[PDB]
Every structure is written in structure tokens, then in C-alpha cells.
Design a protein around this nucleic acid. Structure first.
Lengths: 112, 229
RNA sequence: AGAGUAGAUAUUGUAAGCUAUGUUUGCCACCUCGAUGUCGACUCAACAUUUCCUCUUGGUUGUAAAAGCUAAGAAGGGUUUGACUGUUCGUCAAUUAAAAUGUUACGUGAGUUGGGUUAAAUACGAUGUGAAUCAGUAUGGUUCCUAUCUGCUGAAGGAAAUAUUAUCAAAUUAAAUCUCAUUAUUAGUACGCAAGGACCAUAAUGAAUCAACCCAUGGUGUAUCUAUUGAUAAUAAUAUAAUAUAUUUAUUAAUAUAUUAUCUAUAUUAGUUUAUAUUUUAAUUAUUAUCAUAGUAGAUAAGCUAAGUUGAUAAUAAAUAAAUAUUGAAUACAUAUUAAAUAUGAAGUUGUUUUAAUAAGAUAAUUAAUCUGAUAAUUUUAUACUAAAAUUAAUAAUUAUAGGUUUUAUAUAUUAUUUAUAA
RNA sequence: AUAAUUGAGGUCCCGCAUGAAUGACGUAAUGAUACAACAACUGUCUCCCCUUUAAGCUAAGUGAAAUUGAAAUCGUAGUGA
RNA sequence: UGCUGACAUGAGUAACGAAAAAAAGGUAUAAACCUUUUCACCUAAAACAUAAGGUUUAACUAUAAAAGUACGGCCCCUAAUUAAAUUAAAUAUAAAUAUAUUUAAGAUGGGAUAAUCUAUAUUAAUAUUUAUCUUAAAAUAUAUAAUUAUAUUAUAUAUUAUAUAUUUAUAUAAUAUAAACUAAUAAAGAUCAGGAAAAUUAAUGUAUACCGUAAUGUAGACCGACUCAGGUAUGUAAGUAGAGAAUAUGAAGGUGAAUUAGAUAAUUAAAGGGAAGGAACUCGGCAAAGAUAGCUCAUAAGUUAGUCAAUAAAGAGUAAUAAGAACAAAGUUGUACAACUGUUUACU
RNA sequence: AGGUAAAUAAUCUAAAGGGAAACAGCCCAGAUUAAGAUAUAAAGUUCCUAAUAAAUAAUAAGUGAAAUAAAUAUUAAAAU
RNA sequence: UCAUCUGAUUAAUUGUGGUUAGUAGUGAAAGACAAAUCUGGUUUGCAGAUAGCUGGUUUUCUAUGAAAUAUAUGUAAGUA
RNA sequence: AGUAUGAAAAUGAUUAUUUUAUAAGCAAUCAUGAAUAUAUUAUAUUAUAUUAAUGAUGUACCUUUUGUAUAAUGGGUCAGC
């Protein structure tokens, strides 16, 4: 149930790193994407090209934003009177800074 | 009960409902991204549904047709955005696949998602129309788009097309009128080139497309095999 | 000594005598006295042999036969299910070839149980002035731990290879395995006054155990099909209504589809809900879905299972234990040798058999327009992850992994009052 | 009563060491109390099998604990606080 | 088992605390955030109102708007009760202080008027519980100087027509639903005998204080060392079912969560099913199994006479004939002991 | 009885070294620091493991070879 | 926690507030409770209680070097 | 819980040297090859240093004890106290 001794430096290290099962393997199965000449996984789509195509689809197949007439044709002063500004909470501010906590996809290296 | 399908870490009732939802989403949005295992199971359902629809369309037996219809109805959630999904299935989706013997979907593997390391895939409908009757482009048929992008890249590099690319193009063609296919390719080029910011001289592009079509369409050792002495 | 008809040594064996043993009741306090494994059960057994049965064999006026009695070798295999009891034990029932005796922290819980003995409540008999007490009896009553090391069970990777690889593999080693019963014949024979009643040996059953398998059988089957109850939410079809196109037509009827909708409002003496009139366009059949433990129920493909199926107890042979002999001196004789020669003889031994581990050896190729592997993809015969194995065809050629499809088949449950074509 | 019963009920009374408000004896009713008997039913068992879900196992993220003289930490016999 | 600090080991291990997810897009950034759509779970609630509590946790700093009538506080008055208070010499006492009396405090309670809106001020005088039965009456059939018949039975409202006043005013008769439930009413059963305490007109006023107000409240916003399956007061609480707030569903609403994705070995938990047996288990039928209306009948022995026994057991009709929601419903008898209903070791 | 009660001697206790396989107490022997030639002690000298060769008996059982198990039986052997 | 079992108009259950506790209240009586637990709470103080008991007690070198007996001891784990 | 500074240790990763995949225990010492490192008198056949070829011998410390490797006791480890 309980360790009888302080496990030594040797014995913890040979346990962890000695076996190949536990080690990380080289990703030999990279290959060139045909659409953009960059690294991608074998039997896998290029995340750049499919992302680009998804973006294209979004730009074309776009549901139009609903702008109400009455709010679109307000005067500036009138709009200010109706819908004044406010102090956002700390939480709200944190939520707003998305680049702090949201990871955009990185581009791979160009294949040789 | 063991081995017939993926369990997907869900109770039976939940699992089936999930699969139905996935099928509905596939029919609505002609491609969808999800986890690999879910996609694989969803394909099985969707394909089955498509075949049933085809059978209903074709069969002379009225009772059979009615039964097929009932089965199709059972296998979908018809509400909200999928109210008129049955109609779409009969009129829009299933008529694409009348000549095609199975294989209506394609699950294309993606790079696994970063937060979770979950293997990610794209379940999508085969031979989805890239251009509707309105002057727009349609969401779906990712593989075709990728192929055309690869072709464009090859043209830019002034390289020959890869054998695999040609094979893929041939596969795409098999259930496609040649002129229609060409027109689709041209349409894809217009969007793709602009996105990538390469110049679109139209006549030259058309000629290239034609050349690509021609080679696709017109079909043309270490050990020796010797009889026993 | 004494039994044992007649005889101490067939079997019996006092008192004393000499040992062994290291199981028990002690005795000692030498271990820790932060060793419950708290004494019994269950799970699991391992080991001894001081043999219960089973195999071999001596004696047995107390071996006719059969039962036995007794002793030798022998541990290969096997050695039980209940009633009561906390029980070990025992009695008892029914069995079995037999129901051995132990050791293993009175084998076994960081594996279980917790009934007993066991703290706090408690009462009973007895004791004490009393608090309380008791080898008493009794109801009740809390146990933990994710394994670090060793060990064991499997499984990989690395590796040094009498130096490659693919593959085929032997000696061996590590294990396993090893039975037993009953009836039948031999035979109512031997044997006996009958009454009984065989050895040797062999076959057939079975038993126990192990192993494999899913064709059938049974099971399960949150695959699936059918049946059914209660609410609910759909889709469709139609009726209706309205908006938007189209359009017969002349904005508007109409025609067509598309969408959207099926409300709502007011009575009926406080409120609520329902009911009906009122208001309004405010719809009546197909088919679904979810929930109700898979909602419940009848079936049920595969798979896996055991109630099922199949196989097996691994010969022959080698030397042997005990035991039974031949010739034969030393030692005229005699003596199976603790002389030389010469023989038999065991469920034991060595082998055999089977499983796994290894890799002597073998055939084959050798820098690759196609060398051997590995990563990657699709999976399964295989599986925790791995490992193993199938496939990665698309080429003039020749191979289908999976899904899908398709065909046949199965399931479900209706069905000839049918299915489809005439003309 | 069971095939067979150290339990149970009835009964007997050399009452080790019962006995009358520390109340005696006997009923009905009640009891999550205790013991025993019957029926019914069962995966408790003969004998386990199958299936569902949550883990367990693998990948990604975050990330404990008791313990620990130092450890290059096998078997057996003997040995020795 | 020294103390403080730092850092190790176990170990990248166990665990990530009841759970339903999908997609598409925000956003060529999202398992985890927002939006839309589908699916699901809660629904006498995971809903809507609230009380208490609290790092304001909120739909936030440009912030939780009150003269009063279904607003509370404040305020007036008290209960339990409290009080360096109170009363030559209130009484008693090592001191502290204590007691008795007064007096001031003390809400969990009492407290004026009001939508045809309402006016609190100053001054002068002078209700423990519990029931709503019966009977009788009014009414529709019978039948039409009947018997039956079954329902009606105190209240609240609009309408119509009057009638009285002159289109208000009020009376008067006239028609007008089932089920709940509610408030004012009345009359009424028992023993366990059911709080306290704060004028009247009339005259004259009354330019309306302060304070709570978010959200959270069966919980991630209080108590539990944690965003902790514990604890936490109140009224509501679609419909359809039913005796019912039981049980099913769930319109609307509100959720889907600080772990996911695969996988589903052995193994454990939580379930479902099981051939032939049928308690052989075992300390012991522990656990599991077992329900032939739930309604209406019918219901023994015994006995303290109490359908106690008894919801008896069995049996019956309504339903059902192969079966085909949930939920209540789980046999009988002997013995010991205790009469009973209760209480007790909050954590053996 | 590794018992217990003293007596006596020694060691241990508080003593490192050599021997007795290992070894608190037995057999030797007492470390001041070295060193390592010369005597040795106890104990040993086939190997492991420093170091040997002989005589003479007797044993045949591996008795035995650093932890001697008995009454008794048998077969021998001497002697009287 | 779940499954189950039990009371469920009463010796019922609970909200707001008050009273009684550290020689000490409350207790349908169990040493039960009095703020995660009492044969008597907690804090502070006495106070460095007291410990014939247990543990700890730190550099070096040098020289000598014990005893575990007798006696007495409310003494035999101590002390003379 | 001052301000600097900080090659203090424990501890993490990495590399370099060197050893290690037929060898079994306080992990050291001694013996002894070997490899490497540095060296301004290595003249060298040198020196030193680092280092688990290799062989021998070697039962942690402390407390407490008639007596401990002890499976009696205390300590995870370092720094401060």
C-alpha cells in the first residue's frame, strides 16, 4: 500500500525513461500536402487548406445580420440618450480579452 | 449487442439520439466536423437512410415504399431547422445517389484537436453540388475543393499532376457528366485563385481544366511469373 | 509375562527398559511485546509421509475361497455431501475405493466473513456492605490501506547475434500429465461339506479431473422485430387563414406553388381549472419520436457461454524398491551374492505424452527501378496499452481490411382475400 | 419435529445457584427485539453464464496522499537479540 | 516521531465530487464562453415568488426609485425575557452582587382609513382543537288532494326590468356550470378548558420623513476547511391521471455543469435476464426473490369485546384470458421478553 | 531448558585481532603510529582457501571428513 | 448514498426569540449532551505544576578505568 | 513580512568524461588493469586527478540493552534553531 523507502534517483529514472513504451516517438509519418507544399500528417488533411476552404464557405454561405430599421436610422445624440455607456465588470473585461486565453492555429513548415 | 457498433460512452437511448442528430446535421450542412468515432458511426446511419430513401423512390411495391418511408421518418428528428428534412431527402439528397452503389459519405481525418487530443474528422456527403441555381457557392464537397486547390498549386509550380491527384479526379468524375464537372472546377478556381491571390486569366484556366479532364477520361519487374516444369 | 482352542513372537503385548519426535498440555521469558492476520468458516492451497484407498509382496494350526488380519515397498493419483453445534471436535444420516495423519505464524484477509472469545448499553444466577464482579448464561454491537520493494501471473520493449534477414526448426529445459470405479467374460471354473466364490487377465460402461469447441441445445442478446398502457412532441395529407412570389386574368377576384398559422378574447356572482355558448381561420386521417427501470411483455442473428459438444489419463520400452529365484564356494554342508556368474518384479523411477521457453541446425536473399523491418491508414483472428495477425488493389497484370452496397440466408409477423404483367 | 437436529416447542424436576411489587404465574394486542417451524419464492446455493452503465485501461489538461536511515533490494539450508 | 524553512519520494500516479449530448456560427481562435437549432433532465422542481445569511456575488459605477390601500421596516403596544435602572432605612449580602417592587427595554405576535380611493395630526369637552352531519327547507321527474327520485342549499356578480330619488342613488324581483380552493358568516363536539397589552364626538389640520428594494436563496452567491451528493424557512407550484401534493408525463420555464476523447481485459460497484433444481447457502433464507385490484363485498380462532385480531388469511364481483406503465400493497404460526403509543448511546 | 538459586574461574559486559563455516560470552591473543624481515599462538596445510610430506595400523560403511544418538540384534576379531 | 424498514394529530414536527453549564446545567437515564463528542467544556492564569518514567544532550587529543554485590529502604525501574 | 548581495545545501533537467545489458547484498575501503582529464622542469618508461574491468575483505548509524545487521528505537533530505 505504502512505499517502504525513499525511491532513489536511479530507480525512479530507469522506471520512467528506461522503457520505450513510456518514451515519445518521432513522428516519421509526416508528408507534403498537395494543395500547399507544407508538412501534414499521413492519411490526414492539411489543416491550412481545409481551414481556408471553411473560411471561403463562411464568406459565401453567410446568413445576413439582422439590423433593425429604427436603430439603424437613429441620430447619434438620440442613440447616446437612449443607450448610454457602462463600466464592464472585471470578469467581463477578462472575457473580452480573448487573445489572452484563446489559441489560434499555427502554420507548419514548408516541405523540401 | 457487443461488437455490432461503437458504444461511444453513452447509454443506448442517448447514443441513438446523438447519431440521429449527427445524421440530421450532415443532411442539413453537407459537411460536418466531429470526433472520429462519432463520425464513423454517423456515416453508417446516414448512408443507411440514403439507401432506404433510394429504395422508396425506386420500388414499384407500394407497401414496401410506405415501410421505407416510415423507417426514414423514424430515423430522423423532424423539427425546427429539420422540419422539411424528409422532403429534402426525397427531392434533393437521394436523387444524387441513384447510380452510386453505396459509399455516399466520406470520413476525412483531420489533425487531432489540441485541448483534448481527440482524433478529429470531417463527415461529409459525396458529390454535393458546389454551385446552386443562385449565383453563390455551396457549403460542402471539401475533397473536391482540396483537389482543385492542389491542381492550382501544381499549375503555379509548372509541375505535373501527382498520380494520386489524378486517381482522385477520376473517382470524382465516375458519377459526373464531364461538362458539368468542368464547369464546377472552373467555378472553384475563380474563388480559390482570388483567396490565394493568383491572377485569373480565364481562357487559359479553361484550357488547363480541359486538359486535366482529357487525361482523366481517356484511359491508356523483380520477380518473373513462370509455369511449373 | 499374559492372551491367542493346542502354541509367548498368525494375531495379541501389562509393569519396567531404551530411543525418536518437536504436532499437543505444559515448562522457560529469549524475541517485538504498534505479530489482529484476533481461535471458526470461506478462497486458496503447498508440503510431509508416520499409506486411508489404489499397485507390488512376505506371514497368517490363527491364508480353502471370499472377505480379512498383519508387515514390506510405495506419496503417482485420489481421499465427501448433508442434520445439529461459533465451533476445531463429535454424534448422526447417506454415501464412496478410500472418506489417512500432519506441517505450512494451531497454512490462509494490506484477499473475505465476523458467528464465537471480543470494549462502551443491558439483564439473569452467584459474589461483595457497596461501587462493581464472575472460566457463568444472554440480546446487541465499526474495521481501514490507491502496492514502493521482494515474490508470483501474464505482456511487451532493449539486448551481444559463435555476429544479417525471412523462415523451418532439433537436444534440452520449465511445466503439465499421470487415475479410478463398476458390470461382463474368463466362470459358477479354481476352491468347498456345503454356504459360497476367485487370482491372473481383458472388454464395456461409467466416475473424477483436465482440455478444446459453439454445428446443434439451453442461456443471455440496452442488435432487432412485434404487442401494449399513460402523457407529450412532431412530420405528412387535407381544411382553413394570412404574407410572398408566379400567374387566369382583370388594384382585385381567380390560378399555382412557397412559407406561416390552427391561437385568441368574454360570460356562467371571490380565485383556480375544466365544460359549454360566445369570439375567431383557429382542421380532422397516414406515419414517426421521446419518456415512463431497455416503460412492460413475446420472440430473438451474432458473440459468449454451459445445462451442451468433442478430446484426453500420454503407450512401448530401460533400470529398479519391496519381494521371489539359478549355479555357487569362502564355510564337506549350506547360502538367490553384505563373493564371481545368472533371473524375475511396482499406480513408483527413467522415459513417453502434452504445453510453454529457447534457437543448435537447416533452406533461402544479400545495397535494393519491388532489400528486411518500423512509423502512418483500414481492421481482427488478437488484445488493458501494447504484442500478433489480415489488408493498404486501382496495373496491360493478376489479391476485398473495414464501411457502404448488393445478393442469398436468419430474425420478426403478418401475408394467396396475395405479387406483378397483360389487354 | 429432521433422512439424520448441541437449535425449537412440549414435558419431567436430585431448582449447580427460581419465586412473589429487584413483584410470581398465564393470555389477548402490539414489536424494525431474539430463537425456531411452515408455505411461497428466489443467482443465496448445485455452478455459475450473459448483458447495461460507472470506473478500471489509452490519449490530452490540471494534479494529491500515507511513507521514506541509505539502498547496486533473488531462492533454499545454516545462522544469529 | 525535536522546531522553522526549502525541497524531495510515492507520481505525473489516484482523482477531477450523482449528470446528455450534437452541430453551425461567433471566431480561417473555443470539448469548457456567447448565439441559433436539435436532443435530453428537473417539473408539489434543478421552475416562479420569498425569509435568513453573505467577500456585490447582479442584467453594475451613467447601479438595486415607495404617503398608504395583497409594502415591509420605522412607529404604537405588549409575550417569553432582560436591565452599573428603579424604590436615616426597599430586603439580603466578605466585595462581587442577589431578591422583590416599580420603571424602561424586548417580535417570532397585536395594530386606523381606504379605488365610487384614503388621511394617521393638534386642541375643547365627555379566537385549543374540530366539524360543517343530520334534519328541515327550495328544486327537476314522477306524476301530473301523492309517494318516491336524486341532486340544491349561508354568503361574494353582472345583466334586465322595475321600484322608489331625480342620468347617478338605492331597493325590488328575473335568468345564470362541474370541480377545487379562499375570505367574512352562522350555528356546534370534545377535554387537554384554549396569550398579553394600546375613549368619544366635535372643531381645526395634513405642501406627505427616513429604511429595506439588485442578484442569490433545495445553493457555484449562506452553514459545513472545497464551486463539498451533507444542512438550510415560506407560498405558488401547466395541463392530462387519479383518492391523493402518491405515480407517469410535462405546456412554460430552467438547466446540460472546472475535465474531455477513446476503450469497454481482469476486476469492483449499480442494474436487467437465466435451463434443471429449489435454502442443498449460511452464524442466521443476510441479500435478492415473492403482490392473481388499490375499489366494492367477505372475512375465523382467540380476546381485556376494541372489525382488537384486521389492511386478517384465503375467497368474490368490476377488468382479464398468452402476455403487453409506473406507483401503494409482501404470508402464516410457536417461544422468550417487554403490556401498549413512545424514549435512548448526535458519529459502532 | 538459551531455566532458575548462589559458589568459583574466565571472557563479555567495556576488547578491536587469529581460530571455531557464519559466531557478545568458546579457543588463542590484548590496536600508541606505521611497517612487514624474523620467530611464532590458537587453528590449519587436495581445491574453494595462506600452507606438507612420511610411517604404521584399521575401516568399506562415504561409517567418517568441526554440532560423536540408545537398550538391544547380527556378523566378525582377539583372549581364556 | 442507495435499497429497505418505521412514526406520520401527536409523548407530533419545525421557524423566530428567551432561560438554565463548568462542582457544572440538561438528561422518558445512554456517563447522553452542554459548538465535530464530557466518569465533567473552553480559554487565560498558577506555570518552566510534577515526573524515581521516556527521549535528547553538539569539537578534538591525552592518561586511568568500573559495577550489576552486601546492607537498608511503602524498597525491589529509585536512593544512601 | 527591511535593502542588497548570494558558485550554501537539499532537489530538476542537460551535457561531457568514465563505467555499465552472465551478475545478486550498508554500495565502501584496499588491491589492480583500463579510459580520460590537466600539468610553464612529462627528461619519461612522468605525476596527479576522474572513473562500480577486476579480486579480496566488509552484517548502516543511534538509543536501550546480559546481548542488536537486527524483523527493538529515531530520523524523507538539506539549511537555520
Amino acid at each position: 500500500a505504502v512505499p517502504k523507502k525513499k525511491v532513489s534517483h536511479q530507480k525512479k529514472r530507469q522506471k520512467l525513461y528506461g522503457p520505450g513504451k513510456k518514451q515519445l516517438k518521432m513522428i516519421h509519418h509526416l508528408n507534403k500536402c498537395p494543395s500547399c507544399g507544407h508538412y501534414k500528417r499521413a492519411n490526414t488533411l492539411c489543416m491550412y487548406c481545409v481551414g481556408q476552404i471553411s473560411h471561403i464557405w463562411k464568406t459565401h454561405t453567410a446568413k445576413e445580420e439582422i439590423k433593425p430599421r429604427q436603430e439603424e436610422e437613429l441620430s447619434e445624440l438620440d442613440q447616446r440618450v437612449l443607450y448610454p455607456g457602462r463600466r464592464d465588470t472585471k470578469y467581463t473585461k477578462d472575457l473580452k480579452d480573448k487573445d489572452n486565453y484563446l489559441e489560434r492555429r499555427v502554420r507548419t513548415l514548408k516541405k523540401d | 449487442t457487443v461488437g455490432i457498433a461503437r458504444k461511444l460512452s453513452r447509454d443506448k437511448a442517448h447514443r441513438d439520439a446523438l447519431l440521429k442528430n449527427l445524421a440530421c446535421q450532415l443532411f442539413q450542412h453537407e459537411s460536418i466536423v466531429s470526433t472520429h468515432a462519432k463520425c464513423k458511426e454517423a456515416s453508417r446511419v446516414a448512408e443507411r437512410i440514403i439507401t432506404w430513401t433510394k429504395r422508396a423512390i425506386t420500388t414499384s411495391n407500394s407497401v414496401a415504399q410506405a415501410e421505407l418511408k416510415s423507417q426514414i421518418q423514424s430515423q430522423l428528428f423532424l423539427a425546427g431547422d429539420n422540419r422539411k428534412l424528409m422532403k429534402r431527402l426525397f427531392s434533393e439528397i437521394a436523387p444524387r445517389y441513384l447510380e452510386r452503389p453505396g459509399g455516399y459519405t466520406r470520413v476525412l481525418r483531420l489533425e487531432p484537436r489540441a485541448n483534448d487530443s481527440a482524433p478529429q474528422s470531417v463527415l461529409e456527403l459525396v458529390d454535393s453540388p458546389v454551385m446552386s441555381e443562385s449565383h453563390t457557392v455551396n457549403r460542402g464537397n471539401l475533397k473536391m475543393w482540396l483537389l482543385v486547390k492542389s491542381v492550382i498549386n501544381d499549375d503555379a509550380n509548372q509541375l505535373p499532376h501527382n498520380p494520386l491527384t489524378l486517381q482522385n479526379l477520376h473517382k470524382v468524375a465516375k458519377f459526373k457528366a464531364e461538362a458539368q464537372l468542368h464547369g464546377e472546377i472552373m467555378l472553384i478556381k475563380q474563388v480559390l485563385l482570388k483567396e490565394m491571390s493568383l491572377p485569373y486569366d480565364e481562357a487559359l484556366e479553361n484550357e488547363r481544366t480541359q486538359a486535366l479532364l482529357k487525361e482523366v477520361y481517356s484511359s491508356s519487374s523483380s520477380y518473373v511469373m513462370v509455369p511449373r516444369p
